[PDB]
Amino acid sequence: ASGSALIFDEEMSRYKLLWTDPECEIEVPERLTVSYEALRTHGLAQRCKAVPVRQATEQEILLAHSEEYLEAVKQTPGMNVEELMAFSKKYNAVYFHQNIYHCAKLAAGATLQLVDSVMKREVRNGMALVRPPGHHSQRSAANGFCVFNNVAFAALYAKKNYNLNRILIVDWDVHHGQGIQYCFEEDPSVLYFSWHRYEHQSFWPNLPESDYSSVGKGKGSGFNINLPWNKVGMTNSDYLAAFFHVLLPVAYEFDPELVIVSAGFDSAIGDPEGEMCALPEIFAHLTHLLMPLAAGKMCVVLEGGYNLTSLGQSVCQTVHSLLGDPTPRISGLGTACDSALESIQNVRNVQSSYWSSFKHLAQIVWPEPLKRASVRTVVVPPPGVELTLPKNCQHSGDISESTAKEVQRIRDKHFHDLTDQNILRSLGNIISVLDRMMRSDEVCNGCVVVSDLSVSVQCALQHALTEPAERVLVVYVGDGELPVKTNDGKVFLVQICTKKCVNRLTLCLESLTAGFMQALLGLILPVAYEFNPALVLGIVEEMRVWGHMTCLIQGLARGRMLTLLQGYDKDLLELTVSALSGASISPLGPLRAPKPEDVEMMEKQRQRLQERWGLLRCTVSESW
């Protein structure tokens, strides 16, 4: 399954507010248009399978709503403006239009088209550009610009027609989404995460059940996860701390069969409702950070987002991320704010009785986003080995004259009496691939099989730093000290081994899968995102699903990851190439809680690196 469905129709623009109502003045049709035009201005909609919009059937509408409310809305076509005003007065923060019933059927049917397109493997992912939104809609009431609940429709549709038992809903709209919560607060098969501007219940919808204390009800306890922002101005560090330390852990432990995103973009910088300071680029990484889930099956559904500029920019970033484009580098990442650390700590503590990973011992302008390769991956197997590579993979091996001259200079300088032609050819391949991915912009990621690790890592690291590469993240797997000076600050080392530096991170992890996953989500990825490396250098030597890591690390360094594999293993070579080429990662399965010793090691590593890498902090710092 390959492709990125984009469901949209201009008809959902043929409804608007027909009177003066400041509560709803932000929700304009222009939104939809300025989104699609944006995707058309950057060639994204053109790279998308344009699945058509349909009307949701009455039975499908009754999946999440009562017959009384459906019949009430069914008469909104056929009301004059006075009757429309009187009807809209019956509900909270919503207006009605003669075409809004039709457009709500269209939004629900478009969400259902997205779910059908993804689940039927016609596409891998997809985004729905709908209007009106849905997450505030409830069983018998329109609410917060929502008539029908599109995402609840999607989840129930996947549960019914595709017999799914685990579906993850992620609501990164700046408002709560009481509708989705109410719809699945007791259902354990639908895990609802939602972060929202709360301000200690002073912000709309002003509900006590939008607090971190709402964890579900009965069987669904632990499957409702609210993250309340009790202050505005939440930056990218806050959102990524939320992902790394709340959403992603329970998500990968949950192993959802389908991910559905309430992609409201009022959580972006410049929006007049959220008043947050998250750059649109973040919605790339968020999207990317969820893509390894559900074998990539992600159904992004538009919700809020009312600053037209940031709306278009965040839609563009989301679609770029859906199509597998190189995620944009985020700079200036650090610790989340104290209020964010408080929210994260409270939700982790309250959810710890349900997700044992969270238990703890006793104690307005912004820069425009950059434009987001011809050959995504190049593969250098052992000389004389052929493989069946994906459509975006080249065999490379075009060693030039200047490349061989540089290799001869390196050999005469540092590695005298080394006359093996095979390792020299591999070093030339490394240099060529590095030049092609760190300058030519013709390659994103790459992978080379090498035998001599000691000289190969030296060559690769020093040539990367010789090219324009400010910082480098070396993810090494195995034991033994590698020739890596981890003191100049321009290099971070993450060593997964079996058996005292602030720039290094050693991890000596059956449940090794779960422990490694929890570490990657809560330790490796935060330090990596803060470090902001210009290149990722993967090293393996000598039973490990590292494609998840190989995919999640691709968020860093604009996707530039060079893998070095000691020894030829066709299985692992194929795994690396598939993870680099942007393919769907086979799901890791439902992860149990890691062993206590591994949890102690991870907590010790976090405490050892919190003072430098504040993005590891998932708890308020205590004054000395």
Ligand X SMILES: NCc1ccc(C(=O)CS)cc1
Binding site for K ion (CB under 5 A): 171, 173, 177, 184, 192, 194, 196, 220, 223-224
Minimum distance from CB of 23 to Zn ion (Å)? 13
Contacts with ligand X in 116-135 (CB under 6 A)?
133
Residue 145 interacts with, from ligand X, K ion, Zn ion, none (CB under 5-8 Å by kind): ligand X
User: How many residues make contact with ligand X (CB under 6 A)?
Assistant: 14
Among 173, 185, 435, 452, binds ligand X (CB under 6 A): 173
* 561 three-state secondary structure: strand
- Binding-residue pattern over the window 147 to 176 for Zn ion, x denoting contact by CB under 5 A: --------------------------x-x-
Minimum distance from CB of 139 to Zn ion (Å)? 20
Instruction: Pull the structure tokens for residue 584.
Output: 């769907």
- Binding-residue pattern over the window 90 to 119 for ligand X, x denoting contact by CB under 6 A: ---x--------------------------
CA distance 404 to 429: 10
Bin 225: left if φ > 0, else alpha if -120 < ψ < 50, else beta: beta
Instruction: Pull the structure tokens for residue 466.
Output: 């010789």
User: Looking at beta carbons only, is 42 or 136 nearer to K ion?
Assistant: 136
Minimum distance from CB of 174 to Zn ion (Å)? 5
Among 27, 116, 266, 275, binds Zn ion (CB under 5 A): 266
Angle of helix 100-119 relative to helix 150-161, nearest 10 degrees? 40
Taking CA 278 as the corner, what is the angle to CA 521 and CA 516, rounded to the nearest 5 degrees?
5
Q: Does 179 bind ligand X (CB under 6 A)?
A: no
Contacts with ligand X in 186-215 (CB under 6 A)?
204
* 379 three-state secondary structure: strand
Q: Does 196 bind Zn ion (CB under 5 A)?
A: no
Q: Does 175 bind ligand X (CB under 6 A)?
A: yes
The H helix count followed by the E strand count for the chain is 20, 15
Active site residues: 136
Q: Does 205 bind Zn ion (CB under 5 A)?
A: no
* 197 three-state secondary structure: strand
* 243 three-state secondary structure: helix
Residue 522 interacts with, from ligand X, Zn ion, K ion, none (CB under 5-8 Å by kind): none
**Residue 22: is the preceding peptide bond cis (ω within 30°)?**
no
Minimum distance from CB of 283 to K ion (Å)? 13
Q: Does 145 bind ligand X (CB under 6 A)?
A: yes
In this structure, are residues 171 and 321 in contact, taking their beta carbons and an 8 Å threshold?
A: no
* 172 three-state secondary structure: coil
Residue 445 main-chain phi, psi, to 5 deg: -110, 170
Minimum distance from CB of 316 to Zn ion (Å)? 19
Instruction: Pull the structure tokens for residue 522.
Output: 């809560």
Q: What letter represents residue 3's amino acid? A: G
Q: Which stretch binds Zn ion (CB under 5 A): 18-26, 261-269, 287-295, 533-541?
A: 261-269
Helix/strand/coil (H/E/C) assignment for every residue in 272-297 = CCCCCCCCCCHHHHHHHHHCCHHHHC
CA distance 314 to 132: 18
User: Looking at beta carbons only, is 267 or 343 nearer to Zn ion?
Assistant: 267
Minimum distance from CB of 226 to ligand X (Å)? 15
Buried b (16+ CB within 10 A) or exposed e, 346-357: bbbebbeebbeb
Judged by the rule CB under 6 A, the positions of this chain that interact with ligand X are 23, 93, 133, 136, 144-145, 173, 175, 204, 264, 266, 273, 303-304
Which residues bind to Zn ion, rule: CB under 5 A? Answer: 173, 175, 264, 266, 304
